[PDB]
Amino acid sequence: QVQLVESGGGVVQPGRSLKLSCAASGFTFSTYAMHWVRQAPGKGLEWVAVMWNDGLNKYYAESGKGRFTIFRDNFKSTLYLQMNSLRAEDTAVYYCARDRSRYCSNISCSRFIFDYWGQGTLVTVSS
Amino acid sequence: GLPVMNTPGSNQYLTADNFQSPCALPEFDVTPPIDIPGEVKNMMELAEIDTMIPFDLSAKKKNTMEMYRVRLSDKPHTDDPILCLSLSPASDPRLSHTMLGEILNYYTHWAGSLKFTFLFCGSMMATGKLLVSYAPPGADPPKKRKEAMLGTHVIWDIGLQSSCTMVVPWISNTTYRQTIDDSFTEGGYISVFYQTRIVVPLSTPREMDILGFVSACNDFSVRLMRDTTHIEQKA
Amino acid sequence: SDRVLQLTLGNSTITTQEAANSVVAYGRWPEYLRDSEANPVDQPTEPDVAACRFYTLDTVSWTKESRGWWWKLPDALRDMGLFGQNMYYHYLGRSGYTVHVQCNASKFHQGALGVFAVPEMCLAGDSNTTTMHTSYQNANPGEKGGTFTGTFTPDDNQTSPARRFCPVDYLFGNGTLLGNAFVFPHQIINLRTNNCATLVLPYVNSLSIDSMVKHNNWGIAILPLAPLNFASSPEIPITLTIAPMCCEFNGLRNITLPRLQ
Amino acid sequence: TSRDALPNTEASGPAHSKEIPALTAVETGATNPLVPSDTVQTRHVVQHRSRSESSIESFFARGACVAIITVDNSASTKNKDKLFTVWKITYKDTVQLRRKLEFFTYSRFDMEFTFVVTANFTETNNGHALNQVYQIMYVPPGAPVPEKWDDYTWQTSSNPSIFYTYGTAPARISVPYVGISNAYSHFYDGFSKVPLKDQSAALGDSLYGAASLNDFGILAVRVVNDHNPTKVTSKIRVYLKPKHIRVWCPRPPRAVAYYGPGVDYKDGTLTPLSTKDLTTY
Amino acid sequence: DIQMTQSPSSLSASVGDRVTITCQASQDINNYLNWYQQKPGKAPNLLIYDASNLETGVPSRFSGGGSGTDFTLTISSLQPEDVATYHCQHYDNLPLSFGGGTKVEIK
Amino acid sequence: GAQVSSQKVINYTTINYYRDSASNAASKQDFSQDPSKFTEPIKDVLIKTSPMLN
Ligand SMILES: CCCCCCCCCCCCCCCC(=O)O
């Protein structure tokens, strides 16, 4: 069992920005692609973005594209998600997950099966 | 089968062994080489190239561009030295980080002669003469031109040839010297003095700098190899 | 005297009266590909005099505060006449170079410049939280080149990094001491002795021929070994001229239009 | 010209002429090839020293560690599974051999791999374990990487593999020069992709100096024995020795601590030189 | 983009019953689909991958099948601790997407 | 087919067991070269005794 811990969630006023972090332990962080997945209260899962273990290649879902930014620091084994212009529809629990793409920077040789999930951090957009 | 008995040392792993082993990629087709410019056969070739010396290394000038420059001026004559060296190519902080010293720090023993080259970077209107000397060990290190004049020395006249070279000949009791600070195999002393002051006319800078270079001759050698202390890794 | 020289290539020509000498990197002269070492099978293109000629870059001013300058090849010549057209219309290319640095002053000036030619001149970035993360646009400034700095300032906009180099002068921009850079082909311009430098660069690479748009084979760096000063602020210009030699191109396609900004 | 002695030294008397060996011009870029006989009087001596072991072959004739690989052998239900480990082959995980190799720009050589395996218990006795056997499989680029310790991929029909028994002498194999170019490149001043003006920004972005995405591939390591009630931890250490090596285009050595696979450097570690005085011996 | 449709949204069964859940795709995706289990107040857990492979440690009463546009998750004999939400997830191409989820409860 | 070579302080013997040349041991017996390409790269020849520039 590896350990993934998210933090930075809380109450945020509409239209403002927030930053999330996910600290990984128990494995070589710099050799895996990392994902963000969120779940609105009482709803189903929804995928956000991925980054291919190099810090440069990434992909965003259409919901947060333009507003969200994903980046990582391989020396501190940390993953970040910056959110701007948060709307009331962004309230949800955010998870950081790890897939099986180990040395990969392309869709051709990646495969997105999530073996591990974090405990999740809650974000509330309200005033 | 053929009878045999094992001798001591069987099943050990020595990192300097020279045995054969099977190939994991049999019948592999290898790319042919091409004639790339700049091939190297021996490591002493790199040591035989002139590289610049950080003479100053003051507390406020080390790790800057100012450490390579030695200052001259047109002040009246004096018998004090301009610079001093201990001739420890691998352990003296001024010589240790040069290419010669960097290559030496992978070896335990060295021998041969050394060349020192100086370059004058003043205006064409400046003139003067300097003294460069080498004193073998065993006596007081020279602090006055009167003392340095008794050792091996050359007089440099600044003219149309803007550089001077001094060869430090090999002289020692042992056949090799060690690459650490050791009183038994110490090297000597090197210093520079004014022979006559610098003379400059009007409308000219009255201060100027010089640069120094060091390399090895074609009789230089190093034999016993070791790990270097100029690189380290953290846990 | 031995200080005079004349060089001619195509319709260009240069004359100098106060030259030190010409240095050939590793003692090898530029040459075309041999039949025993050519990987591609298509007929190459040799524009010859149409591209093998001297081009003059924009000049720069040398003062007391200057830390240095650097350029990349063949990037610096990407917009020069038909050479750039051939570079962008073809997939593969190779060539040598002749680099000529010009800088003159009076007999009452003093100072010195160190001119270095480095193969595979990698430089260090400015980010302290990522590595190898500088962008194509910043890594290829063109004929304007870049400048060295006297101090290291790491970027801190982690959500929007600048993605550009930060080459320190005394570390030579790549973690190695400047005083050891004389292992590369070089020539020193000392104002009291000579006023120009000439270097002949053959094609050096681990491949017979490569892509000219993606990879730079040579780099040119000019740093003041002794600061400039004059009876007194002093300022003198430095101009740089470069000529491709034995250039050869292969793999003709439609033209490429890179994103330069 | 093979391990032959260096040239002898001649005898020289006083000189009074118009020849000036000691005066030169550093500006030209050449080095003055002087000998002690050109500046001082010397005696004739027969030379015996030679440069036999500063050569490039002898400078790389040392086996150097490059990696440590850790695997476990315990019941899978436990918090830590029977951890088979994956390592991508490189020499930049350590600094010593990296620094030695980066004296040059290009090189060719065959490789020799040596594996040293050690193991130990983690809890208080509670029995022992039978002798263990390890499998080291080479996975070239494009082949399927194992996803479990008992996958079908471990059949190794075409992948090279080594089975090693604990307590025996270290394992060893050889491999040729396997570069797709005419020589390895320790530096690459370029990109793997060009961003086109007519194309979206994300499609042309690439790392600086990356060259090929991954040069040589992967090593996969597992314990072949099923399990034991007691946890046993083991480590594998990889050692490299270049053979038949050639090099070109020398470079200055690294002067500051390494920072990542590139030439980048970190803040607060840019002061290698120490204090001294200009006129102090 | 690809849309995943799950049915039924919820169901009830008695202990020991055979329960079947279906996830449908808007176009053929070969066999690129995973199944996850999520108990209340906890993160999902992987059950099936490649639409048929059973993850190590999962009880043998779970099994997946189907291909193309229709897929099925079945529990041979329901147990008290199987009450949870079940999700389907495809990875045919980016962007990824999940299903709506299906709740399982005891009758 | 064995190779007999002389040690430097008289002979010693070696044999190749594998068909791949990568399996051979280091044969050493290197050859030196002139470093003029690095030390004297200037175009024209240089004579050390005569004045370098005139
Ligand atoms: C168990 C068999 C393993 C075989 C591995 C073959 C790959 C060997 C690669 C060695 C060269 C390493 C790179 C040196 C210089 C460089 O390219 O940066």
Coordinates of N, CA and C in Angstrom, one line a residue, chain C residues 20-21 26 72 118-125 128-132 134-137 139-140 152 154 163 165-168 170-171 173-177 180-181 183-184 186-188 190 193-194 204-208 213-216 256-259, chain D residues 25-30 105-106 180-185 187-210 249-256 259-268 270-273:
Chain C
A20 N 45.9 37.6 -35.8 CA 46.8 36.7 -35.1 C 47.1 35.4 -35.9
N21 N 46.0 34.7 -36.2 CA 46.1 33.5 -37.0 C 44.7 32.9 -37.1
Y26 N 40.1 21.1 -34.0 CA 40.6 19.7 -34.1 C 41.4 19.4 -35.3
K72 N 23.9 30.4 -31.3 CA 23.8 29.0 -31.6 C 23.8 28.9 -33.2
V118 N 31.9 25.7 -29.0 CA 31.6 24.5 -28.2 C 30.7 23.6 -29.0
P119 N 31.0 22.3 -29.2 CA 30.0 21.4 -29.8 C 29.0 20.9 -28.7
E120 N 27.7 20.9 -29.1 CA 26.7 20.5 -28.1 C 26.7 21.4 -26.9
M121 N 26.4 22.7 -27.1 CA 26.5 23.7 -26.0 C 25.2 23.7 -25.2
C122 N 25.0 22.8 -24.3 CA 23.8 22.8 -23.5 C 24.0 23.9 -22.4
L123 N 22.8 24.5 -22.0 CA 22.8 25.6 -21.0 C 21.8 25.3 -19.9
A124 N 22.0 25.9 -18.8 CA 21.2 25.6 -17.6 C 19.9 26.5 -17.6
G125 N 18.8 25.9 -17.2 CA 17.6 26.7 -17.1 C 17.5 27.5 -15.9
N128 N 13.9 26.2 -10.6 CA 14.5 25.4 -9.5 C 13.6 24.3 -9.0
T129 N 12.4 24.1 -9.6 CA 11.5 23.1 -9.3 C 11.3 22.1 -10.5
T130 N 11.9 22.3 -11.6 CA 11.8 21.4 -12.8 C 13.1 21.5 -13.5
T131 N 13.4 20.5 -14.3 CA 14.6 20.4 -15.1 C 14.3 20.2 -16.6
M132 N 15.3 20.6 -17.4 CA 15.1 20.4 -18.9 C 13.8 21.0 -19.4
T134 N 13.1 24.4 -20.4 CA 13.0 25.6 -21.2 C 12.4 25.3 -22.6
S135 N 11.8 26.4 -23.1 CA 10.9 26.2 -24.3 C 11.8 26.4 -25.6
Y136 N 11.2 26.0 -26.7 CA 11.9 26.1 -28.0 C 12.1 27.6 -28.4
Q137 N 11.1 28.4 -28.1 CA 11.2 29.8 -28.5 C 12.3 30.5 -27.8
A139 N 14.9 29.0 -26.3 CA 16.2 28.4 -26.6 C 16.8 28.7 -27.9
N140 N 16.0 29.3 -28.8 CA 16.5 29.7 -30.2 C 16.2 31.1 -30.4
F152 N 22.7 34.1 -10.2 CA 21.6 33.1 -10.4 C 20.4 33.5 -9.7
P154 N 16.5 32.1 -9.4 CA 15.6 31.1 -9.8 C 14.2 31.7 -10.0
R163 N 10.3 29.7 -18.5 CA 10.9 28.7 -19.3 C 12.0 29.3 -20.2
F165 N 16.6 30.3 -20.1 CA 17.9 30.0 -19.5 C 18.3 31.0 -18.4
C166 N 19.4 30.7 -17.7 CA 20.0 31.6 -16.7 C 21.4 31.2 -16.6
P167 N 22.2 31.5 -17.7 CA 23.6 31.1 -17.7 C 24.5 32.0 -16.9
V168 N 25.2 31.5 -15.8 CA 26.1 32.3 -15.0 C 27.4 32.4 -15.7
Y170 N 30.7 32.8 -14.7 CA 31.9 32.1 -14.2 C 31.7 30.6 -14.1
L171 N 30.5 30.2 -14.2 CA 30.2 28.7 -14.4 C 30.0 28.4 -15.9
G173 N 27.8 28.9 -17.8 CA 26.4 28.6 -18.1 C 26.0 27.1 -18.0
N174 N 27.0 26.2 -17.7 CA 26.7 24.8 -17.6 C 27.3 24.1 -16.4
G175 N 27.6 24.8 -15.3 CA 28.1 24.1 -14.2 C 29.6 23.8 -14.2
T176 N 30.3 24.3 -15.1 CA 31.8 24.1 -15.2 C 32.5 25.4 -15.2
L177 N 33.7 25.4 -14.5 CA 34.4 26.6 -14.3 C 34.8 27.2 -15.7
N180 N 38.5 26.6 -17.3 CA 38.7 25.4 -18.0 C 38.2 25.3 -19.4
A181 N 37.5 26.4 -19.8 CA 36.8 26.4 -21.2 C 37.9 26.4 -22.3
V183 N 39.7 24.2 -23.2 CA 39.8 22.9 -23.8 C 39.1 22.9 -25.1
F184 N 38.1 23.8 -25.3 CA 37.4 23.9 -26.6 C 38.2 24.7 -27.5
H186 N 39.4 27.8 -29.5 CA 39.2 29.2 -29.0 C 40.3 30.1 -29.6
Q187 N 40.1 31.4 -29.4 CA 41.1 32.4 -29.7 C 40.8 33.6 -28.9
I188 N 41.9 34.3 -28.4 CA 41.8 35.4 -27.6 C 42.0 36.7 -28.4
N190 N 43.1 40.2 -27.8 CA 43.8 41.2 -26.9 C 44.0 42.5 -27.6
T193 N 47.3 43.5 -29.1 CA 48.0 42.6 -30.0 C 47.2 42.5 -31.3
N194 N 45.9 42.0 -31.3 CA 45.2 41.7 -32.5 C 43.8 42.3 -32.3
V204 N 30.6 18.3 -36.9 CA 30.8 17.4 -35.8 C 29.5 16.9 -35.3
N205 N 29.3 15.6 -35.2 CA 28.0 15.0 -34.7 C 28.2 13.5 -34.5
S206 N 27.3 12.9 -33.8 CA 27.3 11.5 -33.7 C 26.6 10.8 -34.9
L207 N 26.1 11.6 -35.9 CA 25.4 11.2 -37.0 C 26.0 11.8 -38.3
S208 N 25.9 11.1 -39.4 CA 26.4 11.7 -40.7 C 25.6 12.9 -41.1
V213 N 16.6 22.0 -38.1 CA 15.6 22.8 -37.4 C 15.6 22.4 -35.9
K214 N 15.8 21.1 -35.6 CA 15.6 20.7 -34.2 C 16.9 20.7 -33.4
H215 N 18.0 20.6 -34.0 CA 19.3 20.4 -33.3 C 20.3 21.4 -33.7
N216 N 21.1 21.9 -32.7 CA 22.2 22.8 -33.0 C 23.5 22.1 -32.7
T256 N 8.6 24.3 -43.9 CA 8.2 24.3 -42.5 C 8.0 25.7 -42.0
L257 N 7.1 26.0 -41.1 CA 6.7 27.3 -40.5 C 6.7 27.2 -39.0
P258 N 7.9 27.3 -38.4 CA 7.9 27.1 -36.9 C 7.3 28.2 -36.1
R259 N 6.9 27.9 -34.9 CA 6.3 28.9 -34.0 C 7.5 29.6 -33.3
Chain D
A25 N 52.8 33.8 -28.2 CA 51.6 34.5 -28.3 C 50.4 33.6 -28.0
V26 N 49.9 33.7 -26.8 CA 48.7 32.9 -26.4 C 47.5 33.3 -27.2
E27 N 47.5 34.5 -27.8 CA 46.3 34.9 -28.5 C 46.0 34.0 -29.7
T28 N 47.0 33.4 -30.3 CA 46.8 32.6 -31.5 C 46.1 31.3 -31.1
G29 N 45.9 30.9 -29.9 CA 45.2 29.7 -29.5 C 46.1 28.5 -29.3
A30 N 47.4 28.5 -29.8 CA 48.3 27.4 -29.6 C 49.1 27.5 -28.3
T105 N 32.3 14.1 -25.2 CA 31.0 14.4 -25.8 C 30.4 13.1 -26.4
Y106 N 31.2 12.3 -27.0 CA 30.7 11.1 -27.7 C 31.6 9.9 -27.3
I180 N 21.6 3.4 -32.0 CA 21.0 3.6 -33.3 C 21.8 4.6 -34.1
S181 N 22.6 5.4 -33.5 CA 23.6 6.4 -34.2 C 25.0 5.8 -34.1
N182 N 25.9 6.5 -34.8 CA 27.3 6.0 -34.9 C 28.0 6.1 -33.5
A183 N 27.5 6.8 -32.5 CA 28.1 6.8 -31.2 C 27.1 7.4 -30.2
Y184 N 27.3 7.0 -29.0 CA 26.5 7.6 -27.9 C 26.8 9.1 -27.8
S185 N 25.8 9.9 -27.4 CA 26.0 11.3 -27.1 C 25.6 11.6 -25.7
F187 N 25.6 14.7 -24.5 CA 24.9 15.9 -24.5 C 24.1 16.0 -25.9
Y188 N 23.0 16.7 -25.9 CA 22.2 16.9 -27.1 C 21.5 18.2 -27.0
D189 N 22.0 19.2 -27.7 CA 21.5 20.6 -27.7 C 20.4 20.7 -28.7
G190 N 19.2 20.2 -28.4 CA 18.1 20.3 -29.3 C 16.8 19.7 -28.7
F191 N 15.8 19.6 -29.5 CA 14.5 19.1 -29.1 C 14.1 17.9 -30.0
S192 N 13.1 17.2 -29.5 CA 12.6 16.0 -30.3 C 11.4 16.4 -31.2
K193 N 10.9 17.6 -31.0 CA 9.7 18.0 -31.8 C 9.8 19.5 -32.1
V194 N 9.2 20.0 -33.2 CA 9.2 21.4 -33.6 C 7.7 21.8 -33.5
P195 N 7.5 22.9 -32.7 CA 6.1 23.5 -32.7 C 5.8 24.3 -33.9
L196 N 4.8 23.9 -34.7 CA 4.4 24.6 -35.9 C 3.5 25.7 -35.7
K197 N 3.6 26.8 -36.5 CA 2.8 28.0 -36.3 C 1.3 27.7 -36.6
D198 N 1.0 26.8 -37.5 CA -0.3 26.5 -37.9 C -1.0 25.4 -37.0
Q199 N -0.3 25.0 -35.9 CA -0.7 23.9 -35.1 C -0.9 24.3 -33.7
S200 N -1.8 23.7 -32.9 CA -2.1 24.1 -31.6 C -0.9 23.9 -30.7
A201 N -0.8 24.7 -29.6 CA 0.4 24.9 -28.8 C 0.8 23.5 -28.2
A202 N -0.2 22.8 -27.6 CA 0.2 21.6 -26.8 C 0.8 20.5 -27.7
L203 N 0.6 20.6 -29.0 CA 1.0 19.5 -29.8 C 2.5 19.5 -30.2
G204 N 3.2 20.6 -29.9 CA 4.6 20.7 -30.3 C 5.6 20.8 -29.2
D205 N 5.1 20.7 -28.0 CA 5.9 21.0 -26.8 C 6.8 19.7 -26.5
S206 N 8.0 19.9 -26.0 CA 8.9 18.9 -25.8 C 10.0 19.3 -24.8
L207 N 10.7 18.4 -24.2 CA 11.7 18.7 -23.2 C 13.0 19.0 -23.9
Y208 N 13.9 19.8 -23.2 CA 15.1 20.3 -23.8 C 16.2 19.2 -23.6
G209 N 16.8 18.8 -24.7 CA 17.9 17.8 -24.6 C 17.4 16.3 -24.4
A210 N 16.1 16.0 -24.7 CA 15.6 14.7 -24.4 C 16.0 13.7 -25.5
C249 N 36.0 14.6 -28.5 CA 35.6 16.0 -28.1 C 35.6 16.1 -26.6
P250 N 36.8 16.3 -25.9 CA 36.8 16.4 -24.5 C 36.1 17.7 -24.0
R251 N 35.7 17.6 -22.7 CA 34.9 18.7 -22.1 C 35.4 18.9 -20.7
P252 N 35.2 20.1 -20.2 CA 35.5 20.4 -18.8 C 34.7 19.6 -17.8
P253 N 35.3 19.2 -16.7 CA 34.5 18.3 -15.7 C 33.5 19.2 -14.9
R254 N 32.5 18.4 -14.4 CA 31.5 19.1 -13.6 C 32.2 19.7 -12.3
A255 N 31.8 20.9 -12.0 CA 32.3 21.6 -10.8 C 31.3 21.8 -9.7
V256 N 30.1 21.6 -9.9 CA 29.0 21.7 -8.9 C 28.1 20.5 -8.9
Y259 N 22.0 18.2 -10.7 CA 20.6 18.5 -10.5 C 19.8 18.0 -11.7
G260 N 19.3 16.8 -11.5 CA 18.5 16.2 -12.6 C 19.3 15.6 -13.7
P261 N 18.7 15.0 -14.7 CA 19.4 14.4 -15.8 C 20.1 15.4 -16.7
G262 N 19.8 16.7 -16.6 CA 20.4 17.7 -17.5 C 21.6 18.4 -16.9
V263 N 22.0 19.5 -17.5 CA 23.1 20.3 -17.0 C 22.7 21.4 -16.0
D264 N 21.4 21.4 -15.6 CA 20.9 22.4 -14.7 C 21.6 22.4 -13.4
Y265 N 21.5 23.4 -12.6 CA 22.2 23.5 -11.3 C 21.2 24.3 -10.3
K266 N 21.4 24.0 -9.0 CA 20.5 24.5 -8.0 C 21.1 25.7 -7.3
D267 N 20.2 26.5 -6.7 CA 20.6 27.6 -5.9 C 21.2 27.2 -4.6
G268 N 22.2 28.0 -4.2 CA 22.9 27.7 -2.9 C 24.0 26.7 -3.0
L270 N 26.6 27.1 -5.6 CA 27.4 27.6 -6.7 C 28.7 28.2 -6.3
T271 N 29.3 27.8 -5.2 CA 30.6 28.3 -4.6 C 31.5 27.2 -4.3
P272 N 32.2 26.6 -5.3 CA 33.1 25.5 -5.1 C 34.4 25.9 -4.5
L273 N 35.0 27.1 -4.9 CA 36.3 27.5 -4.4 C 36.2 28.0 -3.0

